[PDB]
Ligand SMILES: C[As](C)(=O)[O-]
């Protein structure tokens with residue numbers, strides 16, 4: 001790899017291998033990030049309605065479709081000291097939530113924790129579903145499919 005590899009990939013690659021026992025490639029990182037981005041969009045299911053019922057004109061964290069299981073991953077992510085590239089990866093995915101309403105700035109400030117939780121959740125699913133320390137394209141495509149069915 002060189003310094004041109006998209007920013008964050010480096011650090012994610014390094015964290016997944018050394019701390020989670022998952023060997024990623026550029027190809028499987030892209031698949032992983034597309035699945036994270038998809039799941040992130042799914043968290044906005046019901047969010048505009050919940051915001052309106054609360055008298056708000058913006059989406060708050062309280063309005064998102066986050067479950068207890070994801071909340072646990074988000075909390076575990078916040079206690080990680082090593083930088084796994086989440087800030088760079090967030091910019092890389094160029095996330096646009098599927099809503100017309102304003103996303104509140106305090107929620108925007110939590111996007112790194114949400115994405116970090118989604119990354120740890122995906123690592124958990126990779127290990128429990130693929131059977132491969134170095135997942136193939138098809139293994140990762142399967143992870144994205146089964147993740148889509150819990151969001
Ligand atoms: C030098 As590396 C991103 O393969 O840990």
Ligand SMILES: [Zn+2]
Nearest residue numbers: 001002005026
């Ligand atoms: Zn590369």
Ligand SMILES: [Zn+2]
Nearest residue numbers: 001013014024
């Ligand atoms: Zn590498």
Ligand SMILES: [Zn+2]
Nearest residue numbers: 137138141142
């Ligand atoms: Zn395929």
